[PDB]
């Protein structure tokens, strides 16, 4: 008996953002004006941000081999 | 006996954004006039902002494997 | 018996943000004017920020291998 | 003779106001307007109160446990 | 002779107000007007009140276990 | 003769207000306008009050446990 498998296999993920071109993003104009405003709660607000924000709690691999001769 | 099985084989995700061009996005104007405006619950805003923003909690791999030679 | 199997296979995972081109991002005009306004709760503000934030909780790897030749 | 036997039980009483929401109670407008009234006898009297009040006379435990071994 | 019986039960009492939500309760508007009137004998008034009151005298727990072994 | 009985149960009350959330209870208006009122016998009033009371005259335990070998 010639026990000889091959593995050259490949498992991939690419999630996410990868090779994107962003070229003079935000070369334009904001003018905010605000004059007398009231919030009684959260506020969150952007203006002409422009942040690169990753949150990447995924990605992990398992490989999990078992072997066994029993003659 | 000759056992001797090949695994070439790609198994391949890609997922969210791959490759995207943006030549020069948000080239424009933006104006906001806001004068006496009242908020009671939450405010979340965004103005000409033009973040990237990734979230990946999948992408995760598994490979199982198994031999087994009974004689 | 001759055993001899072969594992060369790649097990990978690309999450996140891989490879991306940013030229010149940000290279317009923000104007913020705010006179008089009024917050009762959290505020969070961004203004022409363009940060690099990365979490990465992830991205872990398991290899589990065994063998065991009873005779 | 093995005289062995075994109490994991529970015995619960939850008994009143538990594990309740509240959220935002009484964000509204109240307005009373009284002129010239007589009142010739007690006046008790609540406006927009939202009090929390809780009496607990109850909830006692009693366990009584009796062995004896007679030869 | 073996004696071992085994006991791991529940006896639960869930009684009056448990688990619910109440989303902004109260949110609207509410007007009294009076005038000239004239009472004679005990008023009890509540007006946009939104109380929380509990009253518990219940919720009381009794075990009685007896053993006896007689040779 | 063994004689090796286990008690690990449990006797519990929860009783009154227990593991409840009041979020911002009491965000609203209220007001109060009383001109020239007469009152001839007691008066008990509350505009707003939002008081926490805990009476709690129960809540007691007894345990009584008792063994005797007789030989």
């Known amino acids: ?3 000889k ?3 050259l296999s490949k498992v991939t ?3 996410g953002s ?3 071109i962003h070229h003079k ?3 334009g ?3 905010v004006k ?8 959260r506020v969150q607000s952007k203006i002409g941000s422009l942040d690169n924000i990753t949150h990447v709690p995924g990605g992990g691999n398992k490989k999990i081999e078992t072997h066994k001769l029993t003659f």
Do not use: A, R, T
């Not at 605000?34 to 709660?41: G, M, P, Q, V």
């Open 1 to 3: 008996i010639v026990y």
């Open 13 to 15: 993920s690419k999630c």
């Open 34 to 41: 605000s004059e007398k405003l009231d919030f009684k709660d």
């Open 5 to 7: 498998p091959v593995d």
């Open 29 to 31: 104009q904001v003018e």
């Open 18 to 20: 990868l090779g994107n």
């Open 25 to 27: 993003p935000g070369g």
